[PDB]
Amino acid sequence: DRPRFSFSIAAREGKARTGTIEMKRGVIRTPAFMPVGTAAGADIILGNTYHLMLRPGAERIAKLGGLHSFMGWDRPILTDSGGYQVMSLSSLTKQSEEGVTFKHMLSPERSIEIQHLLGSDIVMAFDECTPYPATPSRAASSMERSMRWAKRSRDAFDSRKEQAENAALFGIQQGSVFENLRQQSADALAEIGFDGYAVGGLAVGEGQDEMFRVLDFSVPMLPDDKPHYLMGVGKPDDIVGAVERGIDMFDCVLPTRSGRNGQAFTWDGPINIRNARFSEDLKPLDSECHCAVCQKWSRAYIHHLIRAGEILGAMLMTEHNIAFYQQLMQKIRDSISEGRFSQFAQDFRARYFARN
Amino acid sequence: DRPRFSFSIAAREGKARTGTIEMKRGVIRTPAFMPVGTAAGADIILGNTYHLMLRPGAERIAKLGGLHSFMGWDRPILTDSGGYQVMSLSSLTKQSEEGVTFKHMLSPERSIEIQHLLGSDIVMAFDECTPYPATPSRAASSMERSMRWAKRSRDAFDSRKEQAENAALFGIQQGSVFENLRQQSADALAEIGFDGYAVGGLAVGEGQDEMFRVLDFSVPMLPDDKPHYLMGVGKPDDIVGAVERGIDMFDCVLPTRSGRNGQAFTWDGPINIRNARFSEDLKPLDSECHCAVCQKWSRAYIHHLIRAGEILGAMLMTEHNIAFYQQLMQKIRDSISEGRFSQFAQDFRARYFARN
Ligand SMILES: CNc1nc2c(CCNCC3CCCCC3)c3nc(N)[nH]c(=O)c3cc2[nH]1
Numbered sequence: 001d002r003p004r005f006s007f008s009i010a011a012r013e014g015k016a017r018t019g020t021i022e023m024k025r026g027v028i029r030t031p032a033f034m035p036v037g038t039a040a041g042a043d044i045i046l047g048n049t050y051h052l053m054l055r056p057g058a059e060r061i062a063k064l065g066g067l068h069s070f071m072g073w074d075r076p077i078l079t080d081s082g083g084y085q086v087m088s089l090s091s092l093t094k095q096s097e098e099g100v101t102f103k104h105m106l107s108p109e110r111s112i113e114i115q116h117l118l119g120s121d122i123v124m125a126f127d128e129c130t131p132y133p134a135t136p137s138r139a140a141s142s143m144e145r146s147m148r149w150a151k152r153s154r155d156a157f158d159s160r161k162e163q164a165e166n167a168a169l170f171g172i173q174q175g176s177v178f179e180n181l182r183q184q185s186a187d188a189l190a191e192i193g194f195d196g197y198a199v200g201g202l203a204v205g206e207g208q209d210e211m212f213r214v215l216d217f218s219v220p221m222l223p224d225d226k227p228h229y230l231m232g233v234g235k236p237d238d239i240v241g242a243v244e245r246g247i248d249m250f251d252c253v254l255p256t257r258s259g260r261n262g263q264a265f266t267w268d269g270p271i272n273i274r275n276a277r278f279s280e281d282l283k284p285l286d287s288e289c290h291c292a293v294c295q296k297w298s299r300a301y302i303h304h305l306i307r308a309g310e311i312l313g314a315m316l317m318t319e320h321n322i323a324f325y326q327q328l329m330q331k332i333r334d335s336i337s338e339g340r341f342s343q344f345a346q347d348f349r350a351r352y353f354a355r356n
Numbered sequence: 357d358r359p360r361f362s363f364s365i366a367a368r369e370g371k372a373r374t375g376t377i378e379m380k381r382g383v384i385r386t387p388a389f390m391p392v393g394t395a396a397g398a399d400i401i402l403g404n405t406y407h408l409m410l411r412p413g414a415e416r417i418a419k420l421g422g423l424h425s426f427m428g429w430d431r432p433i434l435t436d437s438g439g440y441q442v443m444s445l446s447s448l449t450k451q452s453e454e455g456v457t458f459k460h461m462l463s464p465e466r467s468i469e470i471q472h473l474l475g476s477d478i479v480m481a482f483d484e485c486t487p488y489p490a491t492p493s494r495a496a497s498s499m500e501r502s503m504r505w506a507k508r509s510r511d512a513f514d515s516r517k518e519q520a521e522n523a524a525l526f527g528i529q530q531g532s533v534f535e536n537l538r539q540q541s542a543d544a545l546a547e548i549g550f551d552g553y554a555v556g557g558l559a560v561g562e563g564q565d566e567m568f569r570v571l572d573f574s575v576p577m578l579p580d581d582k583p584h585y586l587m588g589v590g591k592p593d594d595i596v597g598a599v600e601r602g603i604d605m606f607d608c609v610l611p612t613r614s615g616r617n618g619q620a621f622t623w624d625g626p627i628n629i630r631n632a633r634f635s636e637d638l639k640p641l642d643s644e645c646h647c648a649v650c651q652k653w654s655r656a657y658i659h660h661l662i663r664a665g666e667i668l669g670a671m672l673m674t675e676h677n678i679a680f681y682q683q684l685m686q687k688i689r690d691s692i693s694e695g696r697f698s699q700f701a702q703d704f705r706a707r708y709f710a711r712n
């Protein structure tokens with residue numbers, strides 16, 4: 001019988017690690033890419049707390065048996081805490097020390113309760129994703145509030161027996177791009193104690209060079225023996241560089257969003273399949289990809305379907321993109337385990353950026 | 357080695373028949389539902405001559421290896437002759453005895469050549485689908501032109517060795533709702549000689565009662581020993597009643613169109629899955645359906661996906677609808693073979709129209 005939560009590192013190369021998270025509903029191989037569940041293999045998928053709390057509502061999801069039953073997925077599910085999406089998507093918001101009001105209220109306690117009603121396995125603390133750019137004062141005030149909310153999240157989670165005994169709780173580091181604030185945030189989170197630690201507040205417009213610079217000093221501040229989750233990242237090259245900096249877990253809408261917008265990921269970089277240059281291209285989307293789409297259909301046919309407005313085209317693109325992301329993660333895990341990840345990262349970038 | 361074309365009737369009940377068409381690329385069980393190939397099991401799929409001749413063009417499809425290679429489908433493909441869709445979809449049309457000009461030209465010879473370049477297995481004669489309603493004079497003139505075009509189609513097909521030796525050609529009966537014109541058309545087509553015979557000019561706004569009345573006298577005019585194809589039909593109850601009147605083959609965009617618009621077919625009638633009454637319905641789309649969607653997901657989840665704008669929702673609906681149509685055809689074939697089709701049709705209508 002698997003434990004509630006146990007992270008084991010099987011191999012390391014530089015700052016990169018590969019290993020497993022064991023939870024009651026399954027094993028998660030790391031570094032992991034965690035796709036959105038409504039996309040269409042992955043070891044864990046993401047639910048959408050913000051959407052679900054509005055439609056059909058968390059109480060209704062619980063009445064229907066929880067998100068595992070609802071979605072037909074019996075393996076682990078991660079949910080975000082909802083505030084990032086409230087601040088990005090809601091029409092109007094009112095923030096206070098209690099939480100955020102929007103047009104519904106979200107507080108640390110209500111976020112944890114919603115995630116309990118959804119039945120997710122990995123629960124995120126309720127935080128504030130500081131906008132970018134931020135002044136040091138504003139980043140500090142925001143981070144300090146997030147740390148108070150992290151403690152409230154911890155307490156709310158621990159009060160719900162079924163959740164405390166069967167799920168896991170991750171804290172989210174904030175502090176914008178400021179090393180001293182990232183350190184204070186890491187210290188506060190470690191004092192509270194979490195099952196895993198996310199790097200929040202990145203992929204918010206700062207660009208890859210700055211994101212990597214912040215990761216360079218921020219990831220080592222987190223406990224080494226627990227998973228490190230970079231929220232909202234990212235493109236394939238973002239993922240590779242983040243793994244080189246000690247990240248174990250990723251989520252991003254990009255493979256699914258790109259698939260619905262004509263973009264396919266390949267080892268030679270992204271391609272826009274709608275472009276006329278693919279109308280007679282008999283090669284698969286990627287000539288090394290092992291996915292079911294690339295085993296059967298050509299770029300020319302997928303181009304044709306997309307240009308015709310056929311939903312099948314976008315679904316084939318999405319299936320390929322999700323599978324490409326999983327193959328990327330598998331190659332990352334294998335190369336770290338074999339001590340050739342540095343070489344893999346160099347080879348990957350040389351080919352991905354050549355765009356051949 | 358299968359023949360170019362051989363239709364065998366295994367069992368009959370009233371006017372209904374069940375049997376098989378053998379062709380080089382496979383066996384087609386009849387009565388057959390023939391879905392569009394770009395939809396997502398069927399024994400034959402439809403290509404889209406009208407679309408393909410415009411994008412990417414028939415010559416380009418041939419350069420890519422033909423429609424079987426292009427679509428990844430090695431079994432039989434039927435193509436229509438393109439004029440029905442030209443008259444329904446084209447912005448402007450100019451008709452003459454030579455053919456139709458539109459904004460490209462289509463004639464019997466060019467239609468057959470396009471279908472040859474696409475590589476389809478069942479080729480339709482190039483006809484004129486008479487608008488409804490039509491006066492007797494207009495229906496007669498139109499039918500007479502279609503019969504001259506049927507002879508030109510026959511000759512063009514016979515001139516192309518690869519096509520004549522490996523594909524089959526169906527003639528299309530016209531004559532609107534007029535028994536004498538339907539008879540003249542059947543006589544003309546039988547004198548030319550075709551591998552199968554379609555009933556054209558129906559499902560054009562006349563409604564089911566009138567369509568069935570025309571089928572009552574029109575199907576017996578066709579050769580009994582060859583397949584009978586009702587073009588563009590239809591809803592499940594249309595199909596059942598048409599089989600009761602001697603039809604062997606059907607095509608319709610309805611299962612695919614309905615799937616992209618929130619409508620699912622069930623043995624209790626169609627349902628609009630977007631309706632709020634399905635938001636908490638844990639039953640599958642249909643509680644007897646054996647499709648992969650109904651084995652795994654609830655109405656509530658599919659409702660959720662569709663309402664969220666997720667492409668996955670429409671694809672699950674389409675997969676279910678296509679599978680439902682195939683299960684309908686299987687039940688039809690089994691019931692005719694077992695001598696219980698009359699009872700099946702009665703039971704089907706009682707439950708389908710009760711809408712429970
Ligand atoms: C895209 N950039 C980005 N995303 C961040 C996210 C959200 C991660 N993705 C969530 C999924 C989105 C699709 C639906 C399901 C949930 C962040 N979330 C939190 N709580 N805090 C961040 O600082 C935080 C920071 C993030 N940066």
Ligand SMILES: CNc1nc2c(CCNCC3CCCCC3)c3nc(N)[nH]c(=O)c3cc2[nH]1
Pocket residue numbers: 392402403404405436437438439440480483484485486528555556557558559560587588589607608609
């Ligand atoms: C919907 N009603 C209807 N359709 C008819 C059709 C078209 C059948 N469906 C073709 C497919 C449509 C989707 C794309 C692939 C081809 C008819 N075609 C011809 N040639 N003649 C008819 O009298 C004729 C009559 C028809 N009546």
Ligand SMILES: [Cl-]
Pocket residue numbers: 048049050051080081082083085
């Ligand atoms: Cl969320």
Ligand SMILES: [Cl-]
Pocket residue numbers: 404405406407436437438439441
């Ligand atoms: Cl057509």
Ligand SMILES: [Zn+2]
Pocket residue numbers: 285286289290291292293294295320321323324
């Ligand atoms: Zn692929």
Ligand SMILES: [Zn+2]
Pocket residue numbers: 641642645646647648649650651676677679680
């Ligand atoms: Zn089904």
